[PDB]
Design a protein around this nucleic acid. Structure first.
Lengths: 848, 834, 50, 222
RNA sequence: CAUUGGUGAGCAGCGAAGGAUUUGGUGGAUUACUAGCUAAUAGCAAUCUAUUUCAAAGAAUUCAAACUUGGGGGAAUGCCUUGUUGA
């Protein structure tokens, strides 16, 4: 399940799963450490932005969390991981084979408590360390001392002592030595929570019936008891602003505030978290403020405040009810359909099976909103009629969007479940749009589509019909009938020209659309389960029923590719943005990437949790999939955006180089007779011809004013043989009659160096050097590469030594060498023949 | 056909920020408005990165392996880019207005001076695939008392020198082992500290101050610690330093003063090596290449980039662009040059591939409103509010004529005949189309008859008729040559404001003020289709607006239009944030391009921010020139309400995004649009999109390779053209042999002829096999000439690309070979010397 | 100049001009602008003018 | 912007300037707000001038003298770029000291610029007045303070105070001591009559950004 | 006959333990998410001070200094620049 194209990135749209979150002051300010399965996320408690995210996904889920100033401790399967700023700073493996339930850190000691009633104590090596690492000892709870351990606490001012609240009593250990210095008398109920009060000595214990016992530990006796009847207490927090309040958070969602000075009940808050997914799992008063933060396993996190009184003197007898400050959330239930809204890959719609349609943000996870369903005033002058107690729309099972008219009329169509119309939604205002789109033959909308131009919305039904509606006006325009069984995909071309529809009678019907003809009818084997069209290239992919993908060219109207290799039904799938790949996820828990040129699988991932939607981003950075369990969207990167990706078939093994990297490096020289030029730049020829005039243009217009004492050998003294190398190489070339090495050097000089050398040839009586250079050039034009630069060098030679060879003309050696030069060159005037013909006939063909 | 990516940004060479050389010494990265460009000085090749900041850039640095690039705009919003593959890795915003970033020369960790804090972070790894947060903090140091301003590492990257507006400088170690080695601070400057550098082996330190003074610090006895050994001073009148650099291997100090001078000093002795005037405007930045001998100056006011070769004094390049001040463009009749007509008075011929101005003409005085080439490459005619319309040669570079008015009106559009002997121009002043004759520079006629100023003119280049259009709400088709002098008007619904003639010469598309493009037929007078546009146009809100953008009808129309060279598309662009590309037969649009996302332009956001608007009024609209620390940055000349004329700060308003003028490319698949920040050049890759043609089941890359290896070369080629994959076509193209080229070229199909021509053009301008290409072209024209001649318009661009290849790159090789031949014949036949 | 910038250029032009000026024989590469390539070659006077 | 306080000499009213345009004049004990201006050029400082009835604010360039309600009375032309304002209130002289480095005494009762002195040592970094004496101590970027007077073109006395520029000076009510603070992290107590420094503190941990000597000789440093 | 002008009394039709206009307040978004303070390689966050001082380093234009002015005539006395008498 390591893959070769996609790699996992993060999982958007999770906030809490129901492990009690932990809080941490940092200076004057607060943060909130929640855990989402195998990660933990850290939120600015003042405004709830996403500061940090755990860096690597822990091996199992996180059992316990605790935080302190800069450090945050998570206790997953067996171990405790100490993290600072997200990155893992210490592992701490506990010498056992039993999971770590609870965890409390106080002073020098970290205290972890397993499930078979044992307490491991890790002590700092020296108190100038910042988190403990020496194993100290291992305190154990024998069954006669107490029941199972429920929580670990450390009350204030208790030197080296640890308050272990078990299911029947409370113990006090002296963790430095470890003698059980105290046992409490057995409570006649089950203890469920514990939490220490901002008065001394006192721990507040919440039992399994509605009974909160304020229990004084120095004396060992109860001082108060408070009865909620018939609730399951699940949270306790002590408001410490100065007003003596208490919030008991039941496991039904009630959050009940008591006033402990006046023995009263201040308030209740009812259904702030859902009864099913756990109720109120943690509910804390931030230390010093009238702010409570509550968090529950329905993937939501909330913040409630206390406004001050209305009354001047009477004060704290008139208590204002606590209102609602701020919150984040996600879906409660796993998601149902996802779709990228816009082509910067910013926003993502996603509908979920608690009937709620969120729009998530990939950049900043505070920009994500839920798209509200508050209907518009009916346009007829009538009454819209539904049950007066409101409930969310049925589960949104198809969804199609266009961004071309955003702001002027609606641009989402959604298709709900067991429901007979579609609803236009908005995306600018984020709200239910004003039109509902019927199907007009009593058939449940099975799939929907939108035109490119954003004017028209097609709604294929389940008795074959196709209805087309204007979206500015919601008003019905056309209605085709070609299928007789259900219609499971609709599509339209970007020229508003050709419409395609695929339906369970194994028919793909092609229509014209400007006029209303029927343009073709293709028949496949099996029912057709999904259509994805791809627009820029006019190709589309039909997930058939016989466990096959069939790609069809929507212009020539015929089946072009047939991708076998799946093994169970195909859930969902998507073309690449560039039309080249298909990702397809299927119910045998695999995701495969297919290449359409080579028509074959080039990648596959086997997933522990079945994937049920798969969607590229349009600007092709990411792949977002969504899974059968777990509320989120899993986001994946794209190594083909950063690298090279080999295309080869693999599925046999798991479950040439030119083509395989689809890139071809051009040849050097095709035939020996065929000409070439120099590979490199093209203005090399022209600078080598006009090197002088160019530099004289470049020189600055005045003269630069310099000093008078200039240390003459500066080109030397920027700090840190006999014959020149080129002339040497030329000479040995003339000795061995092979100038290959010389021509390597002249191809790979620079224009200055070339001109310098060709000026710096010897030019006196036995003209050995001019003869040898001309021989090298002849050999080069014979070898027939670099026609460009050998001609250029000969032109430079005639410029810089035309005088000496014009004078010492009819010397035999120069006569002979120049004749051999003329041999090869008069063979090579055919090039001028070709060019003259090419633009003679080309300009004629163009002008006439 | 309709897949266009941001190819390039032409017409701007430097805007603001910081200029860097590559690791090689070859390429040059320099920040244009909110994008970095890479100008490749050796292989003469340019580009512009695709990613865009939401405000102007202010710091860049490039890794030492040439691999990562960090660019920070103002307000700390860094973007990390993978330089090899040109695709953004990670956005990360440091809150403050950050002032410099330097990678470590090891390339392990990068230091960043933000505010008064020094944050040293570690790089990510370029091999590791992406993640949520890959920047891992190393330290944050906090010595200074006011801003840092500069930042310099060691050569062995473990000590960092920061200079700051504190009037000071500090050394920070990088290990808390070596804190004791580096805890000291430096002192004594009077004004600021604009640089502090190390020596070549780090036993001396230099500190350069805005007051004009260089201190030389050395660890020495009267224990003993870090005295000031020497003080040297520049002596400017009132220039101050604005940017300092030090190449330590050669010990140069290059200092850019605020007056226009720079001086190259030799530092451990302080001798003046050199001194030159760049311009007259403050030099804003300096860099040097690696080996120490291409300097790189940049001056943001007026926007000029300069690269110097200080050994033998020679500008390797001396260039300058136009912010906001361009009124039009027009391509060369070959897709390689582009002409821009600027509001200054300057016409610049800009190369395309390497974005550098070949030539600059400045004979106009006031702004230049229209440019056209002739149907030649020789002359171009240019029209400006001078009152004259001037003709330019482009071989000897001269005004060979200036047609003038008869009372000097302000000319605002230009149009010139195919056989370039008649020039018409029309103004917004007079509503009479003047017609001059080129040779006798007198004016033939004043074609009159509009009632309302002329907004465009054009010449049907086939039938030679002058169709013009005016705010009259009409079009008039004048037929000027040949005893007729008859004229035919057309009423459009409303107030027309740009025009475009088909290539063919039968149709006129006309972009009006209510927001349609109405496409008429000229032989008749009848409207063969319009396309309604007012909606798909993104007008933003200005900060100085008090009305919603959905009502703001500042910009709901297209002031520029252009057909394709095929007859099928119209690009239109306007006074707004979007360029829209329509298809002409189907009347339905293909793509909408957004010119910029740059919140330092006004028309660019759709919805403003309510955190900004308050009781005072808006919040981006206060004055902060008082906050600036410098007299020339406080001085605010602005003649009140001067809507778009004069220099950029001769008005107190922020620029507006607009497309001043749009054209297609006459050779390639591209188009180009002159707008506020330059000329956006948008173009295409078949080598990325999978757009097959006429496929079937049995056509794979494996099958076509098999068809080569058993030698059915025709079939292998047509399978390549059906699959439509660029490497494949190249592969077969070079496989097939020279004897077999003519039969294949005869037997190719008619449908695939245009594609093979397109491929030969794209390979041909930059490849080397000139015999292979020219043999192919000769065979292709030879065996299918007449068909092309019939279908003249599908092949407009394809044959122009081949013809550019022949006259541009083959023809010189012919010239030099022929020159050489005749020189030999002279030298060896002539009379011997003496 | 100030009055043109104030009036946001829509003015009326100068009356006229015709004033003699002198040009030199010079190569076109020495005339154009400084950057690694070149574009034109022929000398700046014409053969008939020499 | 960052704000700037000025309590009226009387004790009652207060004037706060922003740095963007927000000026406001209030009473602070009765809470009643006298005036409020949202002018958008960067204001620097303000003073009351004699009553609560008049105030004068610096601005981007000029000096504007407003009423008790913010109706602008005058636009002082000749005080170009006054980063510092003060009012010496028995002589009725509004005093600005610039960024030009010119020092202007302006009689706000008859409307006639008394004196226009040239402090040549550059843009004035700090400024305070001897109240027992009404003589202006301007502190200059050399590190030297200088005492002026309107009827003397030359500084009455120059006082080499710090190394590097002089951030802020503040003078006793009794007219007999001056504390000055400087950008080389320094603070010096001078005895103005007899002109000897009493005693000086030479390493503060970060520069003394301001000082003030109260109405009881107590010292505040910030 | 119109009314495309008001003000009302009434139906058909829509229609689940109600509906329709108007308005105050707070929360979240509006730019792409790396936590707080300080004297900052660290400490604090229940506290910086009863080590918070030392040592070192640190002093050009011997005064470049309004690049900062609406136009036209001027200037007693000021100011300013150049000369000068007596110390």
């Amino acid at each position: 399940k390591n893959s070769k194209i996609f790699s996992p990135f993060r999982i958007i749209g999770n906030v809490s799963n129901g492990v009690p979150f932990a809080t941490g002051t940092l200076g004057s300010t607060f943060y909130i450490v929640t855990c989402v399965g195998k990660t933990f996320q850290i939120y600015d408690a003042n405004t709830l932005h996403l500061l940090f995210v755990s860096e690597k996904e822990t091996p199992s889920s996180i059992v316990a969390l605790s935080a302190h100033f800069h450090y945050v401790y998570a206790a997953y399967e067996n171990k405790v991981g100490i993290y600072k700023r997200g990155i893992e700073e210490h592992l701490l493996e506990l010498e056992t084979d039993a999971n770590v339930e609870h965890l409390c850190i106080f002073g020098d000691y970290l205290c972890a408590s397993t499930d078979d009633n044992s307490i491991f104590i890790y002590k700092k090596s020296d108190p100038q360390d910042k988190y403990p690492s020496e194993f100290y000892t291992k305190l154990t709870v024998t069954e006669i001392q107490g029941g199972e351990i429920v929580s670990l606490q450390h009350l204030a001012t208790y030197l080296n002592k640890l308050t272990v609240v078990t299911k029947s009593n409370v113990l006090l250990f002296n963790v430095r030595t470890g003698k059980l210095v105290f046992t409490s008398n057995e409570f006649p109920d089950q203890i469920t929570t514990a939490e220490p009060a901002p008065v001394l000595d006192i721990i507040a214990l919440g039992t399994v019936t509605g009974e909160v016992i304020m229990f004084n530990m120095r004396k060992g006796k109860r001082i108060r008891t408070i009865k909620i009847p018939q609730s399951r207490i699940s949270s306790l927090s002590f408001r410490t602003d100065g007003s003596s309040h208490l919030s008991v958070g039941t496991s039904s969602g009630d959050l009940i505030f008591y006033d402990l000075d006046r023995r009263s009940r201040i308030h209740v808050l009812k259904n702030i978290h859902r009864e099913s997914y756990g109720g109120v799992t943690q509910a804390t008063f931030l230390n010093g403020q009238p702010i409570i933060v509550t968090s529950g396993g329905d993937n939501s996190l909330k913040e409630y405040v206390f406004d001050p009184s209305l009354s001047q003197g009477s004060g704290d007898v008139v208590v204002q009810p606590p209102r609602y400050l701020r919150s984040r959330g996600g879906h409660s239930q796993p998601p149902s359909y996802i779709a990228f809204a816009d082509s910067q890959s910013h926003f993502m719609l996603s509908a979920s099976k608690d009937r709620s349609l969120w729009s998530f943000s990939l950049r900043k996870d505070a920009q994500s909103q839920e798209m509200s369903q508050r209907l518009h005033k009916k346009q007829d002058g009538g009454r819209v009629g539904g049950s007066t107690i409101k409930s969310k729309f049925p589960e949104i099972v198809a969804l199609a969007i266009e961004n071309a008219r955003i702001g002027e009329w609606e641009n989402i169509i959604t298709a709900h479940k067991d429901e007979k119309f579609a609803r236009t939604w908005d995306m600018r205002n984020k709200r239910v749009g004003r039109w509902t789109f019927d199907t007009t033959d009593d058939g449940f909308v099975k799939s929907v589509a939108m035109s490119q131009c954003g004017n028209f919305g097609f709604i294929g039904s389940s008795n074959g019909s196709i209805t087309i509606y204007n979206m500015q006006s919601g008003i019905l325009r056309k209605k085709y009938k070609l299928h007789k069984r259900a219609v499971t995909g609709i599509s339209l071309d970007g020229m508003n020209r050709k419409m395609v529809s695929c339906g369970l009678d194994g028919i793909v019907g092609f229509y014209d659309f400007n006029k209303s003809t029927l343009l073709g009818k293709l028949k496949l084997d099996a029912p057709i389960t999904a259509m994805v069209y791809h627009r820029s290239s006019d190709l589309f992919a039909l997930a058939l029923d016989d466990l096959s993908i069939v790609v069809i060219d929507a212009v020539t109207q015929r089946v072009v590719r047939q991708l076998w290799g799946h093994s169970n039904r195909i859930t969902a799938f998507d073309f690449s943005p560039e039309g080249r790949w298909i990702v397809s996820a299927s119910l045998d828990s695999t995701i495969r990437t297919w290449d359409l040129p080579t028509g074959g699988c080039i990648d596959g991932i086997i997933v522990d949790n079945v994937a049920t939607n798969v969607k590229f981003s349009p600007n092709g950075d990411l792949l977002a999939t969504t899974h059968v369990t777990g509320n989120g969207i899993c986001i994946w990167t794209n190594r083909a955006q950063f690298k090279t990706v080999s295309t080869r078939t693999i599925d046999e093994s798991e479950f040439l180089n030119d083509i395989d990297f689809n890139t071809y490096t051009s040849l050097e020289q095709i035939d020996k007779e065929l000409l070439t030029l120099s590979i490199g730049p093209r203005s090399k020829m022209n600078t080598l011809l006009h090197l002088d005039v160019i530099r004289k243009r470049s020189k600055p217009k005045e003269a630069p004013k310099k000093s008078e004492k200039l240390p003459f050998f500066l080109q030397l003294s920027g700090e840190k043989g006999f014959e020149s190398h080129f002339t040497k190489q030329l000479r040995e070339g003339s000795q061995s009659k092979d100038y290959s090495s010389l021509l390597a050097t002249l191809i790979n000089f620079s224009p200055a160096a070339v001109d310098l050398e060709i000026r710096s040839l010897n030019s006196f009586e036995p003209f050995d050097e001019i003869v040898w250079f001309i021989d090298a050039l002849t050999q080069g034009l014979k070898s027939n590469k670099n026609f460009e630069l050998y001609e250029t060098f000969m032109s430079l030679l005639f410029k810089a030594h035309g005088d000496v060879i014009h004078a010492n003309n009819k010397n035999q050696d120069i006569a002979s060498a120049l004749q051999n030069w003329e041999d090869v060159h008069k063979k090579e005037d055919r090039l001028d023949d070709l060019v003259k013909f090419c633009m003679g006939v080309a300009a004629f063909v163009t002008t006439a | 056909k309709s897949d266009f990516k941001f190819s390039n940004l032409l017409g701007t060479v430097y805007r603001q920020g910081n200029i860097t050389f590559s690791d090689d010494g070859k390429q040059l990265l320099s920040p244009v408005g909110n994008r970095v460009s890479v100008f490749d000085l050796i292989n003469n090749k340019s580009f512009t990165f695709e990613y865009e900041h939401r405000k102007n850039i202010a710091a860049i640095d490039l890794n030492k392996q040439g691999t990562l690039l960090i660019s920070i705009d103002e307000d700390g919003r860094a973007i990390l880019v993978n330089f090899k593959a040109r695709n953004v890795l990670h956005h990360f915003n440091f809150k403050e207005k950050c002032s410099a970033v330097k990678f470590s020369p090891d390339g392990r960790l990068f230091a960043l001076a933000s505010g008064r804090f020094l944050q040293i972070w570690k790089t990510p790894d370029v091999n590791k695939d992406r993640q949520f947060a890959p920047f891992v903090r190393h330290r944050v140091h906090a010595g200074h008392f006011q801003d840092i301003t500069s930042l310099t590492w060691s050569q062995d990257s473990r000590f960092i020198l920061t200079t700051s507006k504190d009037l000071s400088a500090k050394i920070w170690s990088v290990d808390s082992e070596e804190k004791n080695l580096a805890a000291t601070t430096f002192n004594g400057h009077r004004d600021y500290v604009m640089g502090a550098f190390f020596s070549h082996d780090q036993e001396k330190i230099y500190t350069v101050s805005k007051d004009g003074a260089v201190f030389v610090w050395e660890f020495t006895k009267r224990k003993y610690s870090w005295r000031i050994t020497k003080k040297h001073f520049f002596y400017a009148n009132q220039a101050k330093v604005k940017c300092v650099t030090f190449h330590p291997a050669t010990r140069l100090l290059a200092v850019g003063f605020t007056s226009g001078e720079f001086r190259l000093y030799d530092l451990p002795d302080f001798t003046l090596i050199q001194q030159l005037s760049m311009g007259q405007n403050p030099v804003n930045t300096v860099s040097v290449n690696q080996t120490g001998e291409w300097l790189a100056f940049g001056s943001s006011k007026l926007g000029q980039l300069l690269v110097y070769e200080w050994q033998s004094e020679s500008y390797i390049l001396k260039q300058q662009g136009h912010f906001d001040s361009t009124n039009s463009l027009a391509y060369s009749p070959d897709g390689s040059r582009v002409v821009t007509a600027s509001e200054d008075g300057k016409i610049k011929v800009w190369d395309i591939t390497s974005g550098f101005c070949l030539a600059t003409f400045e004979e106009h005085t006031s702004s230049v409103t229209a440019v056209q080439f002739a149907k030649r490459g020789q002359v171009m005619f240019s029209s400006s509010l001078d009152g004259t319309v001037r003709a330019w040669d482009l071989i000897r570079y001269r005004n060979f004529r200036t047609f003038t008015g008869t009372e000097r009106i302000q000319f605002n559009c230009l149009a010139v005949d195919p056989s370039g002997e008649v020039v018409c121009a029309g103004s917004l002043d007079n509503f009479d189309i003047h017609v001059w004759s080129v040779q006798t520079g007198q004016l033939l006629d004043a074609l009159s008859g509009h009632e309302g100023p002329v907004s465009c003119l054009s010449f049907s280049q086939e039938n030679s008729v002058l169709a013009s259009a005016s705010w009259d709400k009409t079009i008039r088709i004048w037929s000027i040559f040949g005893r007729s002098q008859q004229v035919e008007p057309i009423e459009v619904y409303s107030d027309v404001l740009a025009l475009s003639m088909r290539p063919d010469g039968k149709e006129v598309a006309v972009s009006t003020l209510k927001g349609q493009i109405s496409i008429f037929n000229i032989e008749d007078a009848k409207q063969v289709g319009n396309i309604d546009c007012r909606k798909d146009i993104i007008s933003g809100r200005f900060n100085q607006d008090r009305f919603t953008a959905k009502n703001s009808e500042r910009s709901k129309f297209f002031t520029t239009i252009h057909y394709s060279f095929d007859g099928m598309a119209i690009v239109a662009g306007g006074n707004n944030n979007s360029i829209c590309l329509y298809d002409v037969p189907n009347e339905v649009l293909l793509k909408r391009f957004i010119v910029s996302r740059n919140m330092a332009l006004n028309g660019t956001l759709e919805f403003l921010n309510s955190k900004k608007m308050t009781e005072a009024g808006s919040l981006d609209l206060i004055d902060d020139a008082g906050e600036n620390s410098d007299l020339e940055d406080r001085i605010d000349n602005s003649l009140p309400g001067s809507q778009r004329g004069g220099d950029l700060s001769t008005r107190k308003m922020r620029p507006e995004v607009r497309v001043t003028s749009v054209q297609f490319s006459p050779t390639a698949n591209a188009f180009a649009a002159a707008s506020t920040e330059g000329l956006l050049i948008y173009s295409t890759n078949d080598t990325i999109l999978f757009d097959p043609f006429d496929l079937d089941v049995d056509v794979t890359p494996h099958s076509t390779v098999e068809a080569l290896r058993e030698k059915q070369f025709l079939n292998a080629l047509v399978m390549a053209f059906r699959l439509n994959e660029e490497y494949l076509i190249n592969k077969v193209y070079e496989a097939i042999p020279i004897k077999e080229i003519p039969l294949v070229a005869s037997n190719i199909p008619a449908i695939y002829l245009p594609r093979i021509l397109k491929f030969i053009g794209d390979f041909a301008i930059e490849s080397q096999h000139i015999e292979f290409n020219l043999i192919w072209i000769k065979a292709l024209l030879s065996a299918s000439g007449g068909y092309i001649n019939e279908h003249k318009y599908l092949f407009s661009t394809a044959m122009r690309s081949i013809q550019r290849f022949i006259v541009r790159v083959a023809k010189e090789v012919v010239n030099t070979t022929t020159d050489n031949k005749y020189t030999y014949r002279f030298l060896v036949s002539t009379d011997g010397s003496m | 100049y100030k009055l043109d910038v104030l009036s946001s250029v829509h003015f009326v032009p100068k009356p006229a001009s015709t004033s003699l000026e002198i040009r030199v024989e010079t190569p076109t590469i020495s005339m154009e602008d400084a950057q690694p390539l070149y574009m034109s070659n022929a000398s700046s006077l014409a053969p008939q003018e020499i | 912007g960052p704000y700037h306080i000025k309590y009226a000499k009387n004790g009652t009213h207060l004037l706060i300037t922003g740095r963007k345009g927000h000026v406001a004049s209030m009473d602070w004990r009765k809470g009643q707000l006298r005036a409020e201006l949202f002018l958008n050029e960067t204001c620097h400082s303000a003073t009351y001038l004699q009553n609560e009835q008049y105030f004068a604010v610096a601005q981007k360039k000029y000096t504007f003298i407003y009423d008790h309600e913010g109706t602008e009375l005058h636009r002082l032309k000749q005080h170009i770029e006054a980063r510092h304002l003060d009012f010496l209130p028995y002589h009725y002289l509004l005093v600005t000291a610039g960024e030009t480095g010119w020092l202007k005494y302006h009689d706000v009762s008859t409307g006639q610029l008394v004196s226009e002195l040239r402090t040549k040592a550059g843009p004035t970094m700090a400024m305070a007045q001897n109240p027992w004496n009404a003589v202006m101590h301007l502190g200059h970027s050399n590190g030297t303070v200088s005492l002026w007077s309107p009827s003397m073109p030359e500084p009455l006395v120059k006082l080499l105070s710090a190394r590097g520029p002089v951030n802020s000076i503040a003078i006793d009510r009794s007219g007999y001591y001056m504390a000055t603070t400087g950008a080389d992290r320094s603070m010096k107590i001078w005895d103005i009559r007899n002109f000897k420094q009493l005693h000086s503190v030479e390493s503060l941990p970060t520069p003394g950004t301001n000082v003030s000597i109260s109405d009881t000789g107590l010292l505040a440093l910030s």
